[PDB]
Design a protein around this ligand. Structure first.
Ligand SMILES: Nc1ncnc2c1ncn2[C@@H]1O[C@H](COP(=O)(O)OP(=O)(O)O)[C@@H](O)[C@H]1O
Ligand SMILES: Nc1ncnc2c1ncn2[C@@H]1O[C@H](COP(=O)(O)OP(=O)(O)O)[C@@H](O)[C@H]1O
Ligand SMILES: Nc1ncnc2c1ncn2[C@@H]1O[C@H](COP(=O)(O)OP(=O)(O)O)[C@@H](O)[C@H]1O
Ligand code: BEF
Ligand code: BEF
Ligand code: BEF
Ligand SMILES: [Mg+2]
Ligand SMILES: [Mg+2]
Ligand SMILES: [Mg+2]
Lengths: 172, 370, 370, 370
């Protein structure tokens, strides 16, 4: 059994397509509601689980918090695909550029388009894009504090070697 | 919200990021009164700027603070920046990160003091300086092409291909609207009309703005104007007297195509555009001839696109197709491009912040900007 | 199905075994940008591969990761294999065996690193590394002959009788289409035209591919081009201008028959073929002489089969018939032959398998692929 | 007695054979007036040449009739040769055979038009066209070496051993003293000085010759110049105003080692040397590394021979001496070489005679000279 999100037990959380707009700790501009600064929000969960969840090859999705965790678990693999050989001062800028560049949302090019509900309206697509850009900017910034933990000029190999690993053999 | 200030040689243009045109446009001018001023206390002041200076021009000495895209007087320039923030936009600059424009091939000290004044005196949160040519590609909505930008003080070319500029193929020419205004103010003397004062400079500019046009064939327009009155036009001066103008009405803008008229050696805007294409790599030239992006207020004479397309077609090999791209919004396309750039979500990590000016001084600008 | 991936030094040729002809043919090039990347966003990439590089080349330093059939630059060769599988064939390589190829008399380490990258990076389920001039003989419908393969980087002969190769009689020559391209730049320089950059090297390759041909009698062709208009013709560059050429059209291919032109001491391709036949045992030589097989893109010059038959018939004893076999699809015959081989039912016993690589290490290719 | 005349892209260098130094050393320039010329009896003439053009330059546009060692303007080139013989040397050309010079890898129409002008118009008794580098080896008193020659218009390597040149290992690079002058006109802008007329190109060339020098270690010299110090030096213009330059002194000639400063996708002079040596046959490389010979005015920057010794030592294998000979007379050593070659008692069989040109036409120049 792979590790599912803690937030699938949460209820009446806001939703877009069928992503969960889970509480977030961040500085980036966007629609995600502030988390408690003392608590693990979905990005501390997604970074904590990623290195275990990308070895499994069979993952049942319980609800919209797992659909969110999967998008995070896939975007960590894109970031570790980018980061090889960078200085932290370059990696911040390269992975923010990766986070902000134009991407396909579910319902548009998207790999898991079989499992994610398309946006409910022309307006739901914008609240989805402005969430997923805020999410993946924070996810990149948070990840970099782990991969450049002990030394600031060389990505720690214990994080970089998952760049070949690929959650359930899917990628963005 | 960011400010975009296209701080030009002849006109300031300013507005917020994401506005579709400048909220302010005014003469890039500062002036001091030229007379005894004996009737004191009716609201006189030590110096005048922008539209106020332009409105009182007859009693003023008028100084442009920029010469050929270089700041030639810093006190006058920071008076204009002060006037943009506290009279024309009416915003705290210390709450608005600011995008600034410069010509390519410029003194490094200009960009440094322009940076220093923003962090030391206007206390701005963050700031950026863009080479004003590449803003014309943002306004034109294209990744590729050769700009020709002709301002008040400078005319310059920049080839770009698929997002990369060719900085060896860039070139500039210190001839634009100012030097054409000087030349018109000279050649009207051939008809016996006379203009000499820093006020009368603006009257001749205001004539050049509406009478003047570009000949499609200069020897034909010369021969026809030398044998008919039908090309002549007339205009009235503020003092009440009237003038009538003939071949002078196109012999002025012809200086862009023949700089030897003002005693310059370097070649006209068609030849320099073609040489800037020929200085690029062999493969990109096909796309550059298809994307000659005109820009800046001196590129707005009637007929200039038709003349430019005729001239470059005589230089380039005829077995390919050459086009001039010249939108109605030409005059503002630098500022419009800066408004687009300042709106990009990927650009927001490129603003140079005071929190990296402090440990680096003005010198950061050359490595962080361009 | 199994992939057949003939990663030649000038073109990758890739597709599926039992398919008619290669479905992914593109330059064996990685391009990297060489200019000021000024426009933020814009879809920019740190490097470009294959036809994506070839079409952008006016701003790129194009470099082939492979030289004389030897991989020189593995960090870019992985980039070409990744482009081949995921962008050009759009497969997952972990699902299909790959038949690769290499030229004979290569380094041992070339063959090792090429198996290691297929199993450890591309995670391939099984693979094999055929000799290119064996594959070209399947594509001829034969089991005896002497394949002259010549590509972009290497020319080689492999004599075969009754399906036995005679490995003592294999000839390699490190001269092919890239040396003829570099020589065409050295002689085009003499008429008036300079080509210098890695991008301009592709313009002259695109001249070589359609203006050049092999003279049947070079010393009389040379006198005919020096006395008539008929041998001269012209080509139109990306910059629209025209290039006219004459004796350069056949002096370029002639380097194959006279390697002294590019400073090499060697036999030409005709005498290299005869020196391979004359190394073989005396009873097989008749069946090699009647089955010379041309292959690879450097054998596509108009008139090369007529010239090759002339020069070999002068070296060979006049008592016996010479045939040069030169199909119109000889442009791809090494891929065509790998697509036969990878579909023969005994071949499915010959692959290096993933499990067998994991247990044996990368030296397994030396004790399974020859 | 024989004449020797080096057709240098920047200076004509001419004299008799056996003289110790050139009699005439003057700019390869034709000048024409660009002003109204109202003053009757000013001593004015329709066109100017050499030092008369250089001294009168304020009223002139200056035209170099050679670009990159290729004559681009024949009608003005025969004006320079006429000035050379009749005004500068004061000789009848019908009394003296002429040794002329040409850089390698050069449009052979140049060589034909040149010999045609000598025989048809100057009626010279006999003449020859030496390779520009092979003369440089004679002046060194040497017979094995790699000649790195770099003038005003061209830079080239000729590797030569026991008097046999390796024509396949000859390498030419169209980057020289003008490209450094024009890059200096570009980067002098960063201080806010400006130079744009052809007369001002000569003022920047006169700066380049005495202010610029080659950094031994470019990044460390940049980091040393980043603090104001003994790096910066004054120069006084013909205008009587002073200018000061800092790291512009060594960014100037660093372009020889980094052609990407002028946007060229080519190796610097160090890798162009090492690539020429590594194209040579394996036994001669030791003797080429031991006998590298510099020539031409662009090899005269302070520190260039020292920095070349440092760069070739970093490319070549470490066991062996590397010795770049930099003669103090290397300003003229091509002409010194011509003064030796035309004087040797074995050479008189090699002149093209007027009597065999009158049979063969101009194409004899190839069959005799290379
Ligand atoms: N319609 C026009 N036709 C020709 N010249 C014009 C026209 N409108 C304005 N000008 C000229 O435009 C110039 C200003 O162009 P601009 O791009 O704003 O220059 P800058 O940015 O450098 O201040 C002035 O010299 C003015 O005389
Ligand atoms: N029509 C042609 N005429 C001459 N040369 C050709 C022709 N077609 C292809 N070539 C040359 O063949 C070479 C590529 O051949 P190829 O067999 O694919 O080589 P490789 O296997 O080493 O990649 C290139 O040098 C190319 O220019
Ligand atoms: N002392 C010097 N230091 C550096 N460059 C020099 C020096 N003297 C002359 N040059 C430059 O070398 C070039 C002239 O070299 P020369 O050998 O005469 O070239 P060419 O033979 O092709 O005419 C000019 O660009 C000139 O400014
Ligand atoms: F400053 Be403007 F562009 F001349
Ligand atoms: F690599 Be190709 F076969 F020359
Ligand atoms: F013509 Be010089 F040798 F550059
Ligand atoms: Mg402007
Ligand atoms: Mg091949
Ligand atoms: Mg010279």
């Amino acid at each position: 059994p792979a590790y599912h999100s803690s937030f699938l037990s949460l209820t009446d959380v806001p939703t877009t397509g069928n992503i969960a707009m889970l509480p977030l700790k961040t500085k980036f501009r966007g629609p995600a509601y502030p988390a408690d600064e003392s608590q693990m929000d979905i990005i501390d969960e997604c970074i904590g689980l990623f290195r275990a969840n990308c070895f499994f090859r069979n993952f049942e999705i319980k609800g919209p918090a797992d659909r969110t965790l999967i998008y995070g678990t896939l975007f960590i693999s894109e970031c570790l695909g980018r980061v090889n050989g960078l200085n932290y001062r370059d990696a911040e800028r390269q992975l923010n550029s990766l986070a902000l560049e134009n991407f396909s949302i579910p319902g548009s090019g998207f790999p898991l388009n079989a499992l994610y509900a398309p946006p409910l309206s022309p307006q739901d697509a914008e609240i989805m894009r402005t969430y997923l850009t805020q999410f993946r900017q924070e996810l990149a910034y948070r990840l970099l504090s782990h991969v450049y933990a002990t030394e600031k000029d060389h990505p720690s190999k214990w994080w970089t070697c998952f760049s070949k690993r690929r959650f359930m053999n899917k990628a963005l | 919200t960011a400010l975009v200030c296209d701080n030009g040689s002849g006109l300031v243009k300013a507005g917020f990021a994401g506005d579709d045109a400048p909220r302010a446009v005014f003469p890039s001018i500062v002036g001091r009164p030229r007379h005894q001023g004996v009737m004191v206390g009716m609201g006189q002041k030590d110096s005048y700027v922008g539209d106020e200076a332009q409105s009182k021009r007859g009693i003023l000495t008028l100084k442009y603070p920029i010469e050929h895209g270089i700041i030639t007087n810093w006190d006058d320039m920071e008076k204009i920046w002060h006037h943009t923030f506290y009279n024309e936009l009416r915003v705290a600059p210390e709450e608005h990160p600011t995008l600034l424009t410069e010509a390519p091939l410029n003194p490094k000290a200009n960009r440094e003091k322009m940076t220093q004044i923003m962090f030391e005196t206007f206390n701005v949160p963050a700031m950026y300086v863009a080479i004003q040519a590449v803003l014309s590609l943002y306004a034109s909505g294209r990744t590729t092409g050769i700009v020709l930008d002709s301002g008040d003080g400078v005319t310059h070319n920049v080839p770009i291909y698929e997002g990369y500029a060719l900085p060896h193929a860039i070139m500039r020419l210190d001839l634009a609207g100012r030097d054409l205004t000087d030349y018109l103010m000279k050649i009207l003397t051939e008809r016996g009309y006379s203009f000499v004062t820093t006020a009368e400079r603006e009257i001749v500019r205001d004539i050049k703005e509406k009478l003047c046009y570009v000949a499609l064939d200069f020897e034909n327009e010369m021969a026809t104007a030398a044998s008919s009155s039908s090309l002549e036009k007339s205009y009235e001066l503020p003092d009440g007297q009237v003038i009538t103008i003939g071949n002078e009405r196109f012999r002025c803008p012809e200086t862009l195509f023949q700089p030897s008229f003002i005693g310059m050696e370097s070649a006209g805007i068609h030849e320099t555009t073609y040489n800037s294409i020929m200085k690029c790599d062999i493969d990109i030239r096909k796309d550059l001839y298809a994307n000659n992006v005109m820009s800046g207020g001196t590129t707005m004479y009637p007929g200039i696109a038709d003349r430019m397309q005729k001239e470059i077609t005589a230089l380039a090999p005829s077995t390919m197709k050459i086009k001039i791209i010249a939108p109605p919004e030409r005059k503002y396309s630098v500022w419009i491009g800066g408004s687009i750039l300042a709106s990009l979500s990927t650009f927001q990590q490129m603003w140079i912040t005071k929190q990296e000016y402090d440990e680096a001084g003005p010198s950061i600008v050359h490595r962080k900007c361009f």
